[PDB]
Structure formats: C-alpha cells, structure tokens
Design a protein around this motif. Structure first.
Motif, PDB file in Angstrom:
ATOM      1  N   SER A   1       1.136   7.651 -13.202  1.00  0.00           N
ATOM      2  CA  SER A   1       1.953   8.591 -12.447  1.00  0.00           C
ATOM      3  C   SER A   1       2.939   7.904 -11.514  1.00  0.00           C
ATOM      4  O   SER A   1       3.742   8.598 -10.882  1.00  0.00           O
ATOM      5  CB  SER A   1       1.063   9.538 -11.642  1.00  0.00           C
ATOM      6  N   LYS A   2       2.879   6.567 -11.424  1.00  0.00           N
ATOM      7  CA  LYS A   2       3.779   5.734 -10.616  1.00  0.00           C
ATOM      8  C   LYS A   2       3.758   6.124  -9.138  1.00  0.00           C
ATOM      9  O   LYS A   2       4.794   6.170  -8.474  1.00  0.00           O
ATOM     10  CB  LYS A   2       5.208   5.758 -11.168  1.00  0.00           C
ATOM     11  N   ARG A   3       2.568   6.406  -8.622  1.00  0.00           N
ATOM     12  CA  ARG A   3       2.374   6.730  -7.219  1.00  0.00           C
ATOM     13  C   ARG A   3       1.686   5.573  -6.509  1.00  0.00           C
ATOM     14  O   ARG A   3       1.006   4.750  -7.125  1.00  0.00           O
ATOM     15  CB  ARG A   3       1.547   8.007  -7.057  1.00  0.00           C
ATOM     16  N   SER A   4       1.867   5.524  -5.193  1.00  0.00           N
ATOM     17  CA  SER A   4       1.297   4.459  -4.387  1.00  0.00           C
ATOM     18  C   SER A   4      -0.182   4.726  -4.120  1.00  0.00           C
ATOM     19  O   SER A   4      -0.760   5.712  -4.584  1.00  0.00           O
ATOM     20  CB  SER A   4       2.073   4.315  -3.084  1.00  0.00           C
ATOM     21  N   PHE A   5      -0.806   3.822  -3.367  1.00  0.00           N
ATOM     22  CA  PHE A   5      -2.224   3.964  -3.045  1.00  0.00           C
ATOM     23  C   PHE A   5      -2.455   5.112  -2.072  1.00  0.00           C
ATOM     24  O   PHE A   5      -3.357   5.939  -2.268  1.00  0.00           O
ATOM     25  CB  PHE A   5      -2.753   2.652  -2.469  1.00  0.00           C
ATOM     26  N   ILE A   6      -1.642   5.177  -1.015  1.00  0.00           N
ATOM     27  CA  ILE A   6      -1.791   6.226  -0.013  1.00  0.00           C
ATOM     28  C   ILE A   6      -1.423   7.582  -0.602  1.00  0.00           C
ATOM     29  O   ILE A   6      -2.069   8.592  -0.306  1.00  0.00           O
ATOM     30  CB  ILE A   6      -0.960   5.882   1.237  1.00  0.00           C
TER      31      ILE A   6
ATOM     32  N   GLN B   1       0.800  -1.213   0.000  1.00  0.00           N
ATOM     33  CA  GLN B   1       0.000   0.000   0.000  1.00  0.00           C
ATOM     34  C   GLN B   1       0.837   1.271   0.000  1.00  0.00           C
ATOM     35  O   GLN B   1       0.283   2.354  -0.199  1.00  0.00           O
ATOM     36  CB  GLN B   1      -0.940   0.003   1.204  1.00  0.00           C
ATOM     37  N   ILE B   2       2.147   1.169   0.216  1.00  0.00           N
ATOM     38  CA  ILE B   2       3.023   2.330   0.147  1.00  0.00           C
ATOM     39  C   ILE B   2       4.094   2.204  -0.926  1.00  0.00           C
ATOM     40  O   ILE B   2       4.675   3.228  -1.320  1.00  0.00           O
ATOM     41  CB  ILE B   2       3.674   2.624   1.514  1.00  0.00           C
ATOM     42  N   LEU B   3       4.394   1.002  -1.407  1.00  0.00           N
ATOM     43  CA  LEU B   3       5.253   0.857  -2.566  1.00  0.00           C
ATOM     44  C   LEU B   3       4.509   1.333  -3.815  1.00  0.00           C
ATOM     45  O   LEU B   3       3.277   1.288  -3.855  1.00  0.00           O
ATOM     46  CB  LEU B   3       5.687  -0.599  -2.723  1.00  0.00           C
ATOM     47  N   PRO B   4       5.229   1.834  -4.826  1.00  0.00           N
ATOM     48  CA  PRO B   4       4.559   2.343  -6.028  1.00  0.00           C
ATOM     49  C   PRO B   4       3.836   1.261  -6.811  1.00  0.00           C
ATOM     50  O   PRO B   4       4.271   0.110  -6.885  1.00  0.00           O
ATOM     51  CB  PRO B   4       5.708   2.931  -6.852  1.00  0.00           C
ATOM     52  N   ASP B   5       2.709   1.658  -7.398  1.00  0.00           N
ATOM     53  CA  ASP B   5       1.903   0.768  -8.211  1.00  0.00           C
ATOM     54  C   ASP B   5       2.266   0.968  -9.671  1.00  0.00           C
ATOM     55  O   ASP B   5       2.114   2.086 -10.185  1.00  0.00           O
ATOM     56  CB  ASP B   5       0.420   1.039  -7.993  1.00  0.00           C
TER      57      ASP B   5
END
Ligand SMILES: *[C@@H]1O[C@H](CO)[C@@H](O[C@@H]2O[C@H](CO)[C@@H](O[C@@H]3O[C@H](CO[C@H]4O[C@H](CO)[C@@H](O)[C@H](O)[C@@H]4O)[C@@H](O)[C@H](O[C@H]4O[C@H](CO)[C@@H](O)[C@H](O)[C@@H]4O)[C@@H]3O)[C@H](O)[C@H]2NC(C)=O)[C@H](O)[C@H]1NC(C)=O
Ligand SMILES: *[C@@H]1O[C@H](CO)[C@@H](O[C@@H]2O[C@H](CO)[C@@H](O)[C@H](O)[C@H]2NC(C)=O)[C@H](O)[C@H]1NC(C)=O
Ligand SMILES: *[C@@H]1O[C@H](CO)[C@@H](O)[C@H](O)[C@H]1NC(C)=O
Lengths: 49, 50
Positions: free
Chosen positions: B14-19, B5-9
């Motif tokens: 935009s290569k941002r995580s969930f949080i 949930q904090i590693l990038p998706d």
C-alpha cells in the motif's frame, strides 16, 4: 427462496428479521425451512458529456 | 535526523509509512458495502450482517 440451515422449533412457523420483516418461512406441505432474499437491485448512474 | 518512520516503506504493497500503518490499524473501519459488492451477500452465508 433458498435452503436454510436454521433449526426451527416445532411450534414456530415464520422467522423474523431485525426490521420485523419475514426472513425465513416453513413450507406447509413439506417441512423444509426456506430462506427469503429480496431480488437483485441497485443504483443506476448515467455518465454523459 | 531520522525520517525512516514517516517516509513511505517500499516493502508495503500500500506504500504507507510505519506510523500511517499504525494509524490505519488503530481505526476499525467497516467495509461499508462498497467492498462487499459480491453476490454472496444475497445468499445466506456466515452470520447475519448489518
Ligand atoms: C533510523 O531509525 C530506524 C528505526 O529505528 C533504524 O533502522 C533499524 O530499524 C530496525 C527496526 O525497523 C531496528 O531493529 C532491528 O530490527 C531487525 C529486523 O527485525 C525487525 O524488522 C522486521 C521487518 O524488517 C520485522 O518483521 C521483525 O519482526 C522485527 O521487528 C532485527 O533483526 C534487529 O535485531 C538485532 O539487534 C538486536 C538489538 O538488541 C539484537 O538483540 C538482535 O540479536 C539482532 O542482532 C533489530 O532489532 C534497528 O536497530 C535499526 N537500526 C539501527 C542501527 O538502530 C535506522 O538505523 C535509523 N537510522 C539512523 C541514521 O539513525
Ligand atoms: C465477481 O466477479 C469476479 C470476476 O468474474 C468473480 O471472480 C471469479 O470467481 C470465480 C469463482 O469464485 C473464479 O473461478 C474466477 O477465477 C474469478 N475471476 C477472477 C478474475 O478473479 C467473482 O467470483 C464474482 N463474485 C461472486 C460473488 O461471484
Ligand atoms: C399431503 O401432505 C402430506 C405432508 O404433510 C403428505 O404426507 C401427503 O401425502 C399429502 N397428500 C397427498 C394426497 O399427497
């Protein structure tokens, strides 16, 4: 000056903005409503060594 | 330990995580005009914009 979709009331001549500047006018000869936009401008930066 | 949930998706463009996606969605950041470089800001379109 561009064509505008503003519906001026018959007793109204000029339209004003938030800064009390004239934004829409009515031509006296023909009763179309004109919209006034300032000419194109912006900043200039010089990138040099 | 679960860090999914904090590693990038990689599915997000935009290569941002969930949080980070939730943090970016909660703040209603204005476009501020650097996005709005288009010349139809000069023309009368949509409504009156600040
Ligand atoms: C570490 O933590 C993560 C997150 O909890 C675990 O990964 C799985 O994550 C998903 C959600 O990210 C959990 O939920 C499942 O989601 C499936 C996909 O649908 C969602 O995701 C898409 C995007 O991928 C969205 O667009 C969509 O709108 C949904 O939000 C669902 O299909 C699953 O449904 C199934 O299970 C439910 C359980 O109640 C059933 O009722 C359904 O009928 C269906 O069978 C599900 O909801 C998923 O649970 C997480 N997996 C696990 C095993 O928990 C990692 O697994 C975890 N890793 C470790 C090591 O702990
Ligand atoms: C700003 O410049 C871009 C690039 O020239 C313009 O994008 C083009 O727009 C026309 C019509 O909208 C399209 O037919 C082209 O395919 C677009 N080109 C690309 C590369 O996307 C854009 O329209 C300009 N902005 C304005 C307000 O005119
Ligand atoms: C003067 O303007 C009016 C419109 O307000 C128009 O009808 C009239 O024809 C004009 N006069 C002349 C001589 O063209």
């Amino acid at each position: 000056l561009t064509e505008s979709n503003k519906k001026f009331l018959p007793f109204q001549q000029f339209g004003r903005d938030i800064a009390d500047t004239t934004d829409a006018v009515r031509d006296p000869q023909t009763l179309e409503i004109l919209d006034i936009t300032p000419c194109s401008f912006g900043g200039v930066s010089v990138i040099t060594p | 330990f679960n860090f999914s949930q904090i590693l990038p998706d990689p599915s997000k463009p935009s290569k941002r995580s969930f949080i980070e996606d939730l943090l970016f969605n909660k703040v209603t950041l204005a476009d501020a005009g650097f996005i709005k470089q288009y010349g139809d800001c000069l023309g009368d379109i949509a409504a009156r914009d600040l």
